[PDB]
Design a protein around this ligand. Structure first.
Ligand SMILES: [Mn+2]
Ligand SMILES: [Mn+2]
Ligand SMILES: [Mn+2]
Ligand SMILES: [Mn+2]
Ligand SMILES: [Mn+2]
Ligand code: NA
Ligand code: NA
Lengths: 516, 514, 515, 50
């Protein structure tokens, strides 16, 4: 590459490797003792349910006055209402302090998170529009004690840490428009503040990785980022790259990424805790650049979904980091299936020899993301120093996921009922919600029928459980060594919203591991 | 209107009202006692799993010989293998007796019926190709799952509805359909007469859905409903034409006001003897020439339009089975019947019976509009208030993408009622799978500038099956606070050979466990 | 026609005929002397530019305090910033009064209104979201003196008077969510408050007509509404209806509307002022129900645009009403081309237009310009006078949005003088326009037909789409007519995300004022 | 085009008095008014169903 590009990519790698969260955590009493009632800046936020906002505990808060009381009355459900308070002592020394009240709904269905962190994100995002200075800290008083989903929700909200606006490209694409946020819980949090910072950091790193454009986050830079963390946090990293993938039988990931300027890479990270592990889990993530397609939606729609194609790789990677930082008692592998699908007719009707030994007929070159997951899955369940009890693969795979489970619920295709319930619980507890997709291999297998290969890479009929079939394809490349629960997570839509990446995935994994 | 057309419709109405099944049920012991070794015809079918076929009880069957044993060893999983038995005694007097062996798979997921009735149907269909004189064919099933097998055999082979080879003159009744005698290993847990009733309702549903829209119209459906009401002795209420407008049913009225035949809200009522175990209301979509959406291409919806009566046919035949078996459930069945015929009505704001207003941003999606009126009717205008409201419809193309060709999508507000219906699907073979229930996220998709709601979700890729179901739930009566079960059966209602008769058996099995 | 629908339609007709604006107008000095520092309710709005908000006069306003001064400092350009004032006197008896400051940008191009009423509407729309009770009066303090565009802008904003939400259907689709608005100018207004009320009423009446669905605003009901205003305001009405259109030679409008349940109608309204008219002007409006189509956009796009296809007829109708109410010195006719169109049917038909020229119908979707052909000939050949200017307004093409955008109506006009006049009317009224290419030499060949005088649609869509649609209409002008013809394509400016904008009437009003 | 060609060919045979016994059947109908009559089964004059 040119010297200017190489310098830029190195700077971007460093910004991801050294990324630290803007969010910190505390509780009302500690805040009272540490900050002596003085607000951090000229902006404060109060978020809670209709009931919680009227609790007497609110009246004892430092910023409370009759004006704030009226704001609580005038605010709409799922909306904000801002009021000024003159002569309220703050660190910035502002003559006024803006207090914004946000009402969270209590309505929540049996498939959602009761604390409704989706609305908490929206409320705080709206409130941060009234931020004055870029160097200030905003106190976010939350009236809920669900520390994990709120930690993720606040990490998710506001201006994104990734930005190319207003000369931020000269500062390694670190946004200067992000405000520091201090979340203040009522009670001391059940999960320690430092652990919550780690969760918040992973949500925002995941967001950065998915927001980053494909000319910054490439197969090479992602690999370098993974290697950077391995050195810093002290975990093992293994990289099977380029022609070595072909030599060693990884025909799927090789075939998909062989046309690119940068070689395809199967990067596997290993974490083994001190003492006896509670479970042995393997993570596999789809991280294919310029790769998004299918038959369920129009071609123009898949170009919009291509924007967030690293969502799977980012989710498993950041979930892995949190496990290492929290020192969770789980033996963990994380395999990043990284390739750049460069240069429609090319590779069409190719027959590839997968690492599993099974042959795949490429009937559609747009659907070359489940192929790399096939190699990733076999590698995890066959080629590692341990055999996992559970395999979790995450990928922004199908447009059918949106039609099936929607914008907020990732699709779960899983072989065992118990594993499904566990992950569903983790979604409701974390706020990164999921919903099951049809598991029935008898009806999925015939859709991949091939005249000359063992299978095709795409279902014949699009209207026959679209999410499920993509999941099934991946399961056919599981190793016979594996006898445990396979969880396929299709997160094509939950990985983003109108403002960009959401950092969906890592907190779901963190909560899943806590209950193992 | 013409005499020739009017006479044809009357003959078709009689064929559906007087429909009798071609299937009967018995067991191996009762079979040997009544027939004493003589087979009913020159064709016999043996269907079972790999283990079941090698059971010692198989070699003690009338038709068994060394050739049949070789069939059991040569047959492939999910395939058939035929052999002749020379000089075998049979009532038809055939020189040979063809024995077709079919192997059923044992593999079945936690969302599928363990007996795999889908393959049973496929096996028996392939075996009936070698029929000589379309004669009663003996089908020996090695499974004891009587209810799903009853439905499985009822839907297999040649369909009773036909317009081939001069069948139009004989009220579209097929002469190619062979009689079938299913022989279970042991005496069935459900009476043979009850199994026959389930088979009949499956085939009547098949007949109604197979029937083209120029035979099964809004008028002929109601006449068929009135026929069974007179025969079986149950009440029937019909709100027809402009009476729907005056009485506030703007949804179903607006949809069918353009048609030659008027729209009809046909409510049937069945109350059993004594205390009913539950009060259940059925609501079915029966709109003629009405199929559309945004998830699939326009050409795809034209193919799905052929089976638009599936929702109405499913609830109607399930109601009939409950009356014939005398199931202890207070039952109502509202048929939302209309013909969407003749840009028209685009951006119309109609006042629904619930009082809520609907902006028609898409005229193709008007199936959920009539269901809204039917749902409010069942939950507000009946003499009783139901505990469970079940609506069934061939509603969305998104259903196929979500749950597939074999599983009806379930959008239901209570977890208990969902698990019940899912169990009913696995027990009966007419399988289902749940679709996301989350009204918080479905409501914003129907936002409207001038009306209370639109009739179609703004974004196509945000739980399409769920949203279409949510719309219907907004028109539930405030009086109702029980379980609502929306069943999207757009795809399971048909296959390559036509209608499946999906729905009735699922309801029956659901009613049996209440 | 069932009795339920008949009663519904009659109730809707009355609601349009008897419509009264929620807005009234006054000024600071008059407001003080009549209300004495007691606000009308618990919400007040302050809308002005950065400079205007920092004018010394702002400190002297009744609601001003250091919290409001801070709101002026923190608010963003084009945004709002709300603050509570405790114990401020107000007639609603609210313990706190909410003051919402909104900043209007000064940036305005040579083709836009300097007052930026587009933002004013948005600011006041945002401010009204924080309303507690709907049955109150909100004081709206504007720091601008451009009274006409502000009047139209404020009439435009907030909840629409038409609604079918929450039982509004039982009250003739009159919204119960609309708040009364008292606009308070700095100086006494150059245009009388009652005249501004009339302009506001027309904007909102136009909004109601376009918002109204096609099952309520039909060809019969619009006609009944026009008749109702004729009786009340005292102007003449002529209605050529049904088979009479065919017999009298109006083959265009007849062919388009003959298939429908309700018959097509050519409604013409005449207004003659007292004394010498400054100009004789004829208005023509497209009001075709279920009719929207073309080749420039996808079929799905035209279905969305179809919701506002009464915008042309509504614009001219309400522009006519304002002329009658303000008694503007302009002899005025207003021809409403009304019909219901309800793809293969009538394709390749050759219809004999009222002008005598034959039209081949190559595309059945584009028959809005056909009804305008008859309307334009009627106005220029069949009336008791001969107009000096002919103005036709229609939501005609999707190309209009591609050409001139969502905020500027496309102008196709033969004389540069009448073009410049209408452009000035747009910039002054705020209902902006922009010229589309006038060049008949290059538009004529696109309508070449084998057997008719012309086709109804251009052969090549990428050859000035807005212009060619306008050219088609000019071919059916009477040979008697030798004046200026102004074709206004307002396909997009007639609506926004919230619904109808009521675009059109205020442009006509301001156009007449400078004749 | 089809009905016109057959009709005008007939007229030429009648005017020229060509030595061919000729019948001319014009299948005339106005197709109004896409979903309408979709999946209908019709009994043709031949007795076969379509
Ligand atoms: Mn969203
Ligand atoms: Mn969004
Ligand atoms: Mn199938
Ligand atoms: Mn099939
Ligand atoms: Mn806009
Ligand atoms: Na300050
Ligand atoms: Na009761």
């Amino acid at each position: 590459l040119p010297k200017a590009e190489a310098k830029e990519l190195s700077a971007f790698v460093q910004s991801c490797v050294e990324y630290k969260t803007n969010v910190c955590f505390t509780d009302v009493a500690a805040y009272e003792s540490n900050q002596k009632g003085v607000l951090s800046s000229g902006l404060a936020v109060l978020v809670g349910t209709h009931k919680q906002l009227r609790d007497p505990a609110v009246q004892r808060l430092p910023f409370y006055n009759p004006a704030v009381a009226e704001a609580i009355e005038r605010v709409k459900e799922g909306g904000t209402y801002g009021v000024l308070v003159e002569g309220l002592a703050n660190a910035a020394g502002s003559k006024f302090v803006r207090v914004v009240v946000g009402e969270v709904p209590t309505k929540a269905s049996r498939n959602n998170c009761p604390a409704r962190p989706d609305v908490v994100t929206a409320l705080v995002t709206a409130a941060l529009d009234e931020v004055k200075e870029p160097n200030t800290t905003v106190d976010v008083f939350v009236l809920s004690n669900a520390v994990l989903p709120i930690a993720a929700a606040v990490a998710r909200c506001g201006k994104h840490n990734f930005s190319a606006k207003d000369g931020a490209a000269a500062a390694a694409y670190n946004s200067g428009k992000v405000s520091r946020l201090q979340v203040v819980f009522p009670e001391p949090p059940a999960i320690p503040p430092k652990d919550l910072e780690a969760v918040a950091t992973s949500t925002q790193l995941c967001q950065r990785l998915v927001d980053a454009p494909p000319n910054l986050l490439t197969t090479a830079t992602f690999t370098e980022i993974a290697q950077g963390y391995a050195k810093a946090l002290g975990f093992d990293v293994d990289v099977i790259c380029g022609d070595d993938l072909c030599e060693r039988g990884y025909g799927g990931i090789y075939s998909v990424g062989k046309a690119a300027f940068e070689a395809p890479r199967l990067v596997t990270l290993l974490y083994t805790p001190k003492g006896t592990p509670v479970k042995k889990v393997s993570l596999v993530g789809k991280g294919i650049v310029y790769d998004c397609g299918g038959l369920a939606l129009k071609p123009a729609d898949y170009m919009k979904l291509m924007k967030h194609d690293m969502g799977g790789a980012a989710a498993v990677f950041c979930g892995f980091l949190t496990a290492v930082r929290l020192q969770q008692p789980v033996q963990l592998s994380c395999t990043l299936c990284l390739a750049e699908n460069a240069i429609k007719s090319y590779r069409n009707d190719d027959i590839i020899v997968m690492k599993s030994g099974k042959t795949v007929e490429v009937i559609n070159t747009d659907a070359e993301g489940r192929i790399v997951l096939g190699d990733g899955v076999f590698h995890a369940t066959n080629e590692l120093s341990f055999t996992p009890d559970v395999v979790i693969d995450m990928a922004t795979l199908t447009g059918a996921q949106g039609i099936a489970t929607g914008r907020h619920h990732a699709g779960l295709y899983v072989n065992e009922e118990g594993a499904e319930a566990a992950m569903l619980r983790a979604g409701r507890e974390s706020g990164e919600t999921c919903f099951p997709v049809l598991y029935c291999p008898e009806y999925h297998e015939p859709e991949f029928k091939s005249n000359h290969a063992d299978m095709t890479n795409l279902m014949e009929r699009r209207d026959n459980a679209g999410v499920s079939c993509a999941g099934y394809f991946i399961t056919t490349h599981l190793s016979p060594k594996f006898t445990g629960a396979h969880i396929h997570v299709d997160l094509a839509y939950p990985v983003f919203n109108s403002n960009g990446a959401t950092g969906f995935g890592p907190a779901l994994l963190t909560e899943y591991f806590r209950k193992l």
